[PDB]
Design a protein around this ligand. Sequence first.
Ligand SMILES: O=C(O)CCC(=O)C(=O)O
Ligand SMILES: O=C(O)CCC(=O)C(=O)O
Ligand SMILES: [Fe+3]
Ligand SMILES: [Fe+3]
Lengths: 341, 341
Amino acid sequence: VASGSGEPREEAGALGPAWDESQLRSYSFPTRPIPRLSQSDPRAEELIENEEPVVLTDTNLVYPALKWDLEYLQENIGNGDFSVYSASTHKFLYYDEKKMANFQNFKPRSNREEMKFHEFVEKLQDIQQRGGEERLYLQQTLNDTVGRKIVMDFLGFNWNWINKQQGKRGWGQLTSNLLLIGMEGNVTPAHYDEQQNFFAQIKGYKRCILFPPDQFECLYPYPVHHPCDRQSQVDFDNPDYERFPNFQNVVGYETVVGPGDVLYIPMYWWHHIESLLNGGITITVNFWYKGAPTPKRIEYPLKAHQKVAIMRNIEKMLGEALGNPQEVGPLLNTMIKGRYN
Amino acid sequence: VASGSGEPREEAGALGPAWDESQLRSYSFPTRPIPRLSQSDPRAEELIENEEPVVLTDTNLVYPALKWDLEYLQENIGNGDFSVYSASTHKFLYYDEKKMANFQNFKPRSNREEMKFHEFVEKLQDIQQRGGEERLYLQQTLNDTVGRKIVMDFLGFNWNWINKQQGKRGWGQLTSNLLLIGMEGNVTPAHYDEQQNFFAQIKGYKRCILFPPDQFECLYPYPVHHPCDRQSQVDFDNPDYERFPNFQNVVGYETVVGPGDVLYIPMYWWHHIESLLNGGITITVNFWYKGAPTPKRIEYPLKAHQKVAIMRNIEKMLGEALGNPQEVGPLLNTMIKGRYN
Ligand SMILES: O=C(O)CCC(=O)C(=O)O
Ligand SMILES: O=C(O)CCC(=O)C(=O)O
Ligand SMILES: [Fe+3]
Ligand SMILES: [Fe+3]
C-alpha cells in the first residue's frame, strides 16, 4: 500500500504523538514508506549495500548533538560566518552562483547572506516576534572556526560506526558536514546529489520524500548548465502536466525523521525535504561521502544512476565543444527530431 | 532565381541540345544552379577553398577515359571482381553491411553481387534485350587487377592538376577512385560523405543536386548506427511532411554534368545523383581525399559540418557507453523531453 510515512510514532513516557498527518503538506503522487530499522539488523545492511534508502533509529551517530538548540549553539558555535538563505515562500529553490553567468534571465527568488550566529538568531526572533511571513534557512559547512564545546560534541559523534560504513561500502572520503537549521514549514524541493549521504536528524521532525534514479523521466531536472542543475523543474504544489506529463507516473518513498534518526540518502536519489508545519525549528547534520570508485569493466545492464551520469557528461561536453551552453538545446533537438523520436 | 540546371548546353558542331528538361525527374523543392567555370578562373579557386561546389569544365582530369564505353572496358579492364548493385526501383538506397547486425528489421531492397566485367555487360544486354524493368549499378574501386591499357589511361589522367588541388587545400591523401557505371534513370538518393570529392564525368549526363551541411535539419539522416547511416530518410518522390516537416524548407544547388566536367562535391555536402532518363548508360570516376586535418584551437563560431561531426560522435559514444545502439534513442529522448524542447 501507499500509507506513506505510516502511523505517527508514539514518544516514550506517553508524551503523545510525535507529530500528525496535518503537519504534512499535500501532493499529487502516492508514496510507500522507507523502512525504519536498527543498525544491528542485517536488512538495513543489505539496503545500504544495494543503494536503497533506510532510516536507522539507533546509530547514536550524533548523540552529543541531541542537546543542541539555538541558545546552546549561540553560546558555543564560534564567531565564524554562517551562510543563510532567505525566501518569500516556503520553497527554497537553490542556485549555483558560478552558473548564473550563463543564464541572464535568471533573477533569484532566494538570496544568500553571510552573518554571525547571533545575527541569524536575532533575525529569526525579530521575524517570529513581529509575526512576519518571510522565511530563513541556515546552511553552513562545519569548519575550523567553531567553539571548543562544539568540537567536543563533534568528537563524540559515532565515528566508529560511520567509518565502518564508509569502509564496507568502498566509499571515498568524508567531504563535509553541513549544518542545516530551518524554520517550520520550510521546503527544500526535489533534487539529487552526487555523493552518498547520512542525514542525521537532531532537533525537530522532517518529512523526507525520495525517488529512485530511474525516475529521471518523471522529474525533469534543469539543464546541467542552468543554475538549478540537479533540481526538478516541476512545482510540487502546482504541477504542470502539459510540460511534465510523466510527473503523473511518479511514486515516492517517504518517511518522517526525528531526533536520533539517520536517513541514508543514496547517491543520485531524488529527495524532497520539508520541516513539519507548526513543528518548530529543525536541525540536521549531513555526512557527505564520495561514492565508491566506478569499476573497471562496466557490467551490463547499466544502473540507472550510471545512465544519469552519462546524460550529464553528454551535456557538459556538448557545452564545451560548442563553446556556449545556450546552444546545447538546439543541437540536441536537431539531433533527435525526425531521427530518434 | 531558381532556374536549377539552367538552359541546356548546346553541343559543338550543332549536334543539338545535350539533353532537355524532360529527362529530369520532378521534385518538391527549388534549386539554384552550381556555377560552371574554368579551372583557370580564380572564382573557381575561391569556391573550392570555401568548400562550396563548382563544376570545372576544362580540367582534363580524366581526358584518357573520355573514350571509354562498355566494349572498350570489357576488352581491357581485367578479370578482377566488380561489385554490382541491383534494384527493383530507380532508387538505389545503400546499406553498410557491417551494420546490418544491429538492426534486424532491415531486409534490403538493393542486393550486392560480385561478378566479372563481361557478366555485368551480359546481364545488362540480357535485360535491355528482353525489355525488362530491373536496374543495375556497377560501383567498384580501381585496384591492381586492371588491364594495361586501362592502367595507361589512368596514368594519363591530369595528376599535375589534382595533386596541386590536394596540396593547396591541405587535404590528406587520395583514398580511392570509384568507378560508377549505371543505367539511364538510376538514382543515388541524398546522402553525404566524409571526404572531399572530385566527381569526374565520362560518359552520359548526370543530374547532381547538392544541399549544404547547414540543412541537416531538413534532410533527416538515419541514425549513425543504422545501415543507412548518412542517407536521408526522406523519400524525394513521396515526401512525408508529417515525419519530416522541415523538408519543406529545403533548397538545393543543382547541375548537369557531362563528359569532361568535374564536380567538386565538398565534404559533408549532401548529394542526390541521377542518370538522365532515356539518356543511355553513364560513367563516372570519383577522386576521394581525406579532408584537411582539424585545426588546433577551434575558432568560433563553428562551421555546420563541425556541428555535424559532433552530433555523429555523440551518437557513436553513446552507443558504446550503453553497450547497445538500440538504446541510443530512448536515452536521447529522456535527455531532452521537458528539458530542452
Ligand atoms: O534538510 C534539507 O532541507 C536539505 C537536505 C539535503 O538536501 C541534503 O542533505 O542533501
Ligand atoms: O554517381 C552516383 O550515383 C553516386 C556518386 C556519389 O555518391 C559519390 O561519388 O559520392
Ligand atoms: Fe540534497
Ligand atoms: Fe556520395
